[PDB]
Amino acid sequence: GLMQFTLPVRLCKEIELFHFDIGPFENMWPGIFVYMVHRSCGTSCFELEKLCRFIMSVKKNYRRVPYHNWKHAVTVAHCMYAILQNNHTLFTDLERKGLLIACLCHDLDHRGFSNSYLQKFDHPLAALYSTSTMEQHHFSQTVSILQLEGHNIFSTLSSSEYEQVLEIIRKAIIATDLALYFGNRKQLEEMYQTGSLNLNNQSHRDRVISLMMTACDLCSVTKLWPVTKLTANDIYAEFWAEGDEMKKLGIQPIPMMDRDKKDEVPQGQLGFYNAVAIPCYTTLTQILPPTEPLLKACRDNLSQWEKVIRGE
Ligand SMILES: COCCn1cc(-c2cnc(N3CCOCC3)c3nc(COc4ccc5ccccc5n4)cn23)cn1
Ligand SMILES: [Mg+2]
Ligand SMILES: [Zn+2]
């Protein structure tokens, strides 16, 4: 059904840009993921029938929430695409496959509630996945969907190669738990500076991949402003929707998840960039220099928030 698709020539060149925006090509998002895989791992790392089967199932299990939904998955997948394409040598054939799948499934069957909420109100997900709650569920879902009839796109890997690819996927879905980013960047940051970072060192390698994921995951901040500005709202609908349930249970939510403090949105976003996004994209560039356009777009949108906060 999908299989017969081919991307328009108008988009081939734009799709390679880091600041590419999938937004006005909704009914092509699956096609673009077929595209980004064929361009990266060639047209014969997955049987086309099995890839298309898998993507549409991935789509199915993305809910109709405001931010953590199928649009957000593809956008992330795209960033990693642009990262991988700009640093083609540095990552193994096997890693390229995993990181393009892992991104796509990184928020699979997401409920639009944080781990804070799922843990504060004792959700069964928090009963099972004690830390990194939603992030563990997300990987879980990749497993089941892979085990579905005719979905195992990796089935052509050796038994050992198969297990390596799941590890990579699992590690990269967990690293998108922002709680782990701070420590991950902190440790990356020192390794590079104290001069001990080493691609060859597999534990070192995993952190590079984890930060990559965090860069792709938040990459809405790296687009043209009228995209970035629109995307900001999407996250807040979700956040405030969380707060609102808390309130219906007698509980006051924190400012970010309280729609009565929406006049502070620029304030939050300006502080988010400075506390999270900028450091992320600084350490990504420092380690992966040709991926610098991200940091550049992140700054651009930062001063756009400045402009707003002080009224221009
Ligand atoms: C506990 O919530 C889950 C963990 N968490 C997620 C975030 C977070 C993630 N992504 C954000 N993006 C990516 C998409 O483009 C918009 C920015 C993000 N923005 C924020 C905004 O930060 C705040 C902080 C305090 C605020 C207080 C009042 C009004 C707005 C605020 N925004 C938090 N996150 C912060 N903590
Ligand atoms: Mg997540
Ligand atoms: Zn995400």
Side-chain angles (χ1 to χ4, degrees), residues 1-9 11-59 61-119 121-209 211-306 308-312:
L2 186 177
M3 300 168 224
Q4 65 200 15
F5 180 82
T6 169
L7 210 70
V9 268
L11 270 56
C12 298
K13 223 146 44 187
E14 285 178 50
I15 213 188
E16 305 293 315
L17 273 11
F18 284 102
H19 67 284
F20 184 75
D21 161 74
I22 67 171
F25 306 108
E26 168 148 356
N27 80 305
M28 280 154 280
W29 293 337
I32 292 154
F33 191 84
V34 168
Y35 185 89
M36 290 183 290
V37 173
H38 284 355
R39 290 285 258 155
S40 193
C41 303
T43 61
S44 66
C45 285
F46 317 85
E47 259 171 303
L48 191 39
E49 60 263 67
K50 294 216 155 201
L51 184 81
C52 301
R53 217 165 282 154
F54 175 86
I55 297 157
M56 298 306 291
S57 297
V58 178
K59 180 179 189 294
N61 298 244
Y62 266 101
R63 281 170 202 240
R64 266 214 164 183
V65 277
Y67 179 72
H68 293 91
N69 58 48
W70 175 243
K71 184 199 182 67
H72 164 56
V74 175
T75 290
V76 172
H78 172 287
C79 195
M80 182 73 77
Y81 176 62
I83 296 200
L84 285 195
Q85 292 280 96
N86 276 286
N87 284 249
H88 216 53
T89 182
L90 297 157
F91 306 89
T92 97
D93 184 33
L94 204 76
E95 292 183 325
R96 286 197 289 278
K97 295 178 194 212
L99 293 187
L100 284 159
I101 299 293
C103 282
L104 192 68
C105 314
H106 88 290
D107 284 314
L108 214 16
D109 199 45
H110 198 293
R111 321 309 222 288
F113 300 115
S114 62
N115 297 325
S116 317
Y117 181 99
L118 293 182
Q119 291 158 7
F121 300 90
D122 303 72
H123 195 63
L125 272 22
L128 276 163
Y129 307 132
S130 198
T131 58
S132 303
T133 295
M134 279 311 307
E135 287 76 36
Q136 281 183 60
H137 184 53
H138 300 326
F139 164 66
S140 218
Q141 290 284 146
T142 305
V143 171
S144 296
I145 290 192
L146 273 170
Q147 294 170 326
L148 281 174
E149 174 64 32
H151 287 57
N152 195 352
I153 71 201
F154 297 130
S155 66
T156 64
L157 280 50
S158 74
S159 160
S160 181
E161 285 176 358
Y162 185 72
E163 291 302 314
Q164 293 159 254
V165 177
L166 267 167
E167 264 300 85
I168 291 157
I169 296 165
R170 189 194 57 106
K171 275 188 216 145
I173 307 234
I174 299 299
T176 68
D177 179 1
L178 199 52
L180 304 160
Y181 150 76
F182 305 106
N184 193 30
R185 197 216 71 90
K186 186 178 188 297
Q187 261 303 305
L188 244 21
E189 176 51 37
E190 196 171 18
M191 281 179 177
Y192 165 95
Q193 294 291 338
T194 50
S196 58
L197 196 59
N198 188 2
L199 283 308
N200 303 341
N201 184 327
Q202 177 59 231
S203 69
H204 290 194
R205 203 165 180 76
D206 289 339
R207 294 201 195 261
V208 177
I209 300 159
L211 180 55
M212 272 161 71
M213 284 295 296
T214 293
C216 297
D217 197 38
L218 309 167
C219 85
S220 286
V221 298
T222 74
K223 311 297 182 161
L224 306 181
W225 173 241
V227 171
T228 286
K229 205 269 152 69
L230 249 62
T231 291
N233 296 315
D234 302 336
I235 209 174
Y236 281 117
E238 214 158 298
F239 288 157
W240 299 325
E242 184 171 327
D244 300 326
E245 302 315 309
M246 309 196 88
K247 289 194 175 179
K248 294 195 283 136
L249 245 162
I251 312 321
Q252 205 232 60
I254 60 83
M256 192 178 65
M257 306 196 166
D258 179 1
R259 67 171 59 264
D260 301 339
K261 313 211 197 72
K262 70 161 62 169
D263 304 324
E264 302 165 39
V265 149
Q267 213 75 222
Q269 290 294 277
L270 191 274
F272 172 78
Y273 276 58
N274 282 326
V276 187
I278 276 303
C280 174
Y281 292 127
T282 302
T283 298
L284 182 48
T285 291
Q286 280 172 5
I287 299 177
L288 295 175
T291 79
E292 193 216 279
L294 293 162
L295 182 53
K296 203 276 186 226
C298 182
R299 293 166 176 172
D300 284 3
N301 293 321
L302 184 71
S303 59
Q304 286 293 329
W305 288 115
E306 282 172 26
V308 178
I309 296 171
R310 50 171 191 260
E312 300 175 36

